[PDB]
Amino acid sequence: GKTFFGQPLGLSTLFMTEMWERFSYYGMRAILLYYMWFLISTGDLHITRATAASIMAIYASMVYLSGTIGGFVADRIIGARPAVFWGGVLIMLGHIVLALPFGASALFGSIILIIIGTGFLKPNVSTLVGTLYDEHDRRRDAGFSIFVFGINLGAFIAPLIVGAAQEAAGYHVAFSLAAIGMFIGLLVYYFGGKKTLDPHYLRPTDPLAPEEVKPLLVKVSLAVAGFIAIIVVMNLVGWNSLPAYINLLTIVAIAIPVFYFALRVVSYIPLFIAAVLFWAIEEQGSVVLATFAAERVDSSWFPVSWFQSLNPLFIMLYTPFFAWLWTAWKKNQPSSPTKFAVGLMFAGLSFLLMAIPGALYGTSGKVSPLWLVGSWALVILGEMLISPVGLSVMSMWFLSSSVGSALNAQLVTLYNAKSEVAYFSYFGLGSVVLGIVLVFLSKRIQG
Numbered sequence: 411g412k413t414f415f416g417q418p419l420g421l422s423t424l425f426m427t428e429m430w431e432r433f434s435y436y437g438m439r440a441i442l443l444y445y446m447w448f449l450i451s452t453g454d455l456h457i458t459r460a461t462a463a464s465i466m467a468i469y470a471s472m473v474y475l476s477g478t479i480g481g482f483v484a485d486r487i488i489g490a491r492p493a494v495f496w497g498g499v500l501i502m503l504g505h506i507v508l509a510l511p512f513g514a515s516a517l518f519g520s521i522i523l524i525i526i527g528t529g530f531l532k533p534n535v536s537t538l539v540g541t542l543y544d545e546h547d548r549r550r551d552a553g554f555s556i557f558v559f560g561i562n563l564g565a566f567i568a569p570l571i572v573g574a575a576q577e578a579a580g581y582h583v584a585f586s587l588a589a590i591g592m593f594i595g596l597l598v599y600y601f602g603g604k605k606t607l608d609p610h611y612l613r614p615t616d617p618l619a620p621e622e623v624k625p626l627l628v629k630v631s632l633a634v635a636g637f638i639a640i641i642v643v644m645n646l647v648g649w650n651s652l653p654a655y656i657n658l659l660t661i662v663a664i665a666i667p668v669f670y671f672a673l674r675v676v677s678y679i680p681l682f683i684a685a686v687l688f689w690a691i692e693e694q695g696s697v698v699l700a701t702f703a704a705e706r707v708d709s710s711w712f713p714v715s716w717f718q719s720l721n722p723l724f725i726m727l728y729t730p731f732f733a734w735l736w737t738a739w740k741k742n743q744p745s746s747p748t749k750f751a752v753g754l755m756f757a758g759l760s761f762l763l764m765a766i767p768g769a770l771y772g773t774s775g776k777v778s779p780l781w782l783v784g785s786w787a788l789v790i791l792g793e794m795l796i797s798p799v800g801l802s803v804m805s806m807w808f809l810s811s812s813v814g815s816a817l818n819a820q821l822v823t824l825y826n827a828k829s830e831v832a833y834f835s836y837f838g839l840g841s842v843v844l845g846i847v848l849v850f851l852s853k854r855i856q857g
């Protein structure tokens with residue numbers, strides 16, 4: 411007769427579980443670039459800083475794309491509950507791999523492991539949350555809200571803890587901290603799920619029928635075949651540097667959506683571009699803005715990675731406010747494409763803001779941290795409008811995020827100290843201009 415804030419106790423298991431995975435994940439991201447910069451300056455890794463930035467970006471991209479595969483493997487083959495478990499193990503392993511004395515050798519293994527891991531875990535945890543409520547129940551809206559608040563809790567404290575740890579005991583002890591985080595998540599999951607989750611999800615809910623096996627295999631086989639063929643063809647011509655490999659992945663990512671657009675509502679062709687653009691800016695925060703914090707701000711008294719805490723902090727502060735807004739502005743609303751429009755403008759503003767300090771002071775010194783503070787605040791305000799309503803204006807919503815990041819892999823190469831004021835301005839203005847185009851067509855789309 412004890413609930414977790416009104417909700418079934420099972421929610422608390424899924425809360426704790428997803429909260430530590432988000433911890434391991436955003437904790438790692440918050441120092442991964444800097445770590446990669448560290449490797450470079452010691453001779454162990456032979457890439458440029460720009461390429462490192464593009465590895466941070468494409469890494470994100472493949473995590474998002476993998477998520478769309480993950481629901482399938484769960485539902486037709488191994489079952490949802492074990493999927494989350496072994497996703498969790500694969501993730502724990504990537505982190506362990508980094509916290510060991512090796513160098514660049516490990517880095518690539520680790521990246522593969524977390525990509526496949528997060529692929530299994532991330533979509534299926536959301537699913538299992540749906541499982542807690544009868545499809546008649548209306549606590550479900552409260553439930554998902556709570557669960558999401560746990561996602562952002564973990565994201566928020568992770569840079570604080572891991573960033574500190576890195577400063578004190580170095581990079582390897584900091585990465586192990588993320589392994590342990592995922593481990594705690596696993597412990598709560600295993601034992602708490604035997605107590606609080608349905609055993610009906612120990613199995614795929616839609617097993618392959620006998621005649622379906624051979625087809626599936628033929629497809630997977632052709633897929634890998636051609637992919638291997640492309641890699642082979644690439645290494646003959648002499649296209650074997652890392653940026654060439656990133657370029658291949660950038661391609662694969664873009665193709666998949668394009669390829670699936672192949673006329674009742676072609677409405678979202680411009681809405682999708684809008685989403686895709688927004689995520690690119692938001693995702694640059696952990697790369698470009700991360701880079702700006704290490705180089706253009708005075709962060710001698712604190713761990714620079716602590717800035718990464720600002721993104722999930724504003725989502726939490728903004729959340730109770732906007733919950734109220736859609737009730738207290740109930741009768742006469744911004745339509746869903748007014749929302750995309752305004753959102754994208756605000757993301758555009760967060761970058762223009764960043765053009766100012768260089769325009770005014772030049773690019774040769776340091777500036778107040780608060781610039782970043784203001785930037786982050788503007789973009790999250792943009793996310794508030796886009797992330798909730800956009801969902802049902804579901805494969806594709808994991809996909810807009812992946813396309814956005816794939817694009818970063820190419821654009822963040824252009825950022826640097828001399829290009830600063832231009833980069834922020836072209837992107838910035840570029841985005842506002844597409845947003846105003848979207849308030850106009852906001853009318854014609856509805857259908």
Ligand SMILES: CCCCCCC/C=C\CCCCCC(=O)OC[C@@H](O)CO
Nearest residue numbers: 479482487617618619620623626627630
């Ligand atoms: C659709 C996107 C690709 C997702 C990757 C799928 C995994 C790759 C190959 C799976 C083929 C193995 C078949 C497993 C299986 O359950 O055998 C059928 C068995 O249940 C007899 O009914």
Ligand SMILES: CCCCCCC/C=C\CCCCCC(=O)OC[C@@H](O)CO
Nearest residue numbers: 487488489492493496497500522523526
């Ligand atoms: C770098 C490549 C590593 C990939 C290794 C692949 C491992 C993926 C998942 C781990 C085992 C999941 C299946 C375990 C299970 O309980 O189901 C077994 C059986 O039902 C499958 O038909």
Ligand SMILES: CCCCCCC/C=C\CCCCCC(=O)OC[C@@H](O)CO
Nearest residue numbers: 506509510511580582583586589590593
């Ligand atoms: C329950 C899961 C356990 C998670 C794994 C625990 C972490 C294991 C080893 C990480 C500690 C550092 C190992 C040695 C090391 O190179 O530390 C860095 C130090 O040598 C300075 O470079």
Ligand SMILES: CCCCCCC/C=C\CCCCCC(=O)OC[C@@H](O)CO
Nearest residue numbers: 649650651653654655657658661662665
């Ligand atoms: C599964 C869908 C595949 C569609 C493939 C379409 C295009 C395929 C190959 C063309 C580009 C391959 C990689 C690009 C590249 O290496 O350029 C970088 C190089 O110029 C720098 O050395």
Ligand SMILES: CCCCCCC/C=C\CCCCCC(=O)OC[C@@H](O)CO
Nearest residue numbers: 759762763765766768769770831835838
């Ligand atoms: C509360 C919202 C505030 C939003 C701020 C509005 C945007 C302000 C400035 C954006 C453009 C500044 C860059 C001006 C510029 O083009 O400088 C280039 C050159 O002339 C000097 O480097």
Ligand SMILES: CCCCCCC/C=C\CCCCCC(=O)OC[C@@H](O)CO
Nearest residue numbers: 762763764766767770771777778781784
């Ligand atoms: C609800 C609105 C309250 C807060 C709004 C934030 C302020 C609005 C626009 C700020 C644009 C940049 C300001 C430029 C500036 O102050 O430069 C001078 C700076 O060096 C301080 O000396």
Ligand SMILES: CCCCCCC/C=C\CCCCCC(=O)OC[C@@H](O)CO
Nearest residue numbers: 762763765766767768769770771772831
């Ligand atoms: C909300 C109001 C936004 C403020 C308006 C945008 C202008 C922001 C900064 C302007 C600084 C000077 C404008 C560009 C500039 O650098 O011109 C000076 C040039 O001769 C030497 O760089």
Ligand SMILES: CCCCCCC/C=C\CCCCCC(=O)OC[C@@H](O)CO
Nearest residue numbers: 707708709710711777778779780781783
């Ligand atoms: C939410 C908190 C955001 C952080 C607030 C940023 C403003 C606080 C401090 C600004 C920089 C000065 C730090 C103290 C310091 O050591 O100044 C350096 C000294 O050499 C003065 O020249």
Ligand SMILES: CCCCCCC/C=C\CCCCCC(=O)OC[C@@H](O)CO
Nearest residue numbers: 653660664668817819820821822823824
């Ligand atoms: C069917 C739609 C076709 C439109 C393709 C969408 C855009 C594709 C790729 C982005 C181009 C970025 C151009 C800048 C760039 O990456 O070059 C700089 C750097 O990569 C040097 O290698």
Ligand SMILES: CCCCCCC/C=C\CCCCCC(=O)OC[C@@H](O)CO
Nearest residue numbers: 821824829832833836837838840841844
């Ligand atoms: C068709 C829709 C496209 C709308 C805009 C798409 C992306 C928005 C702005 C692109 C940012 C430009 C990045 C390159 C750049 O800033 O070059 C100037 C500077 O870097 C000198 O090299």
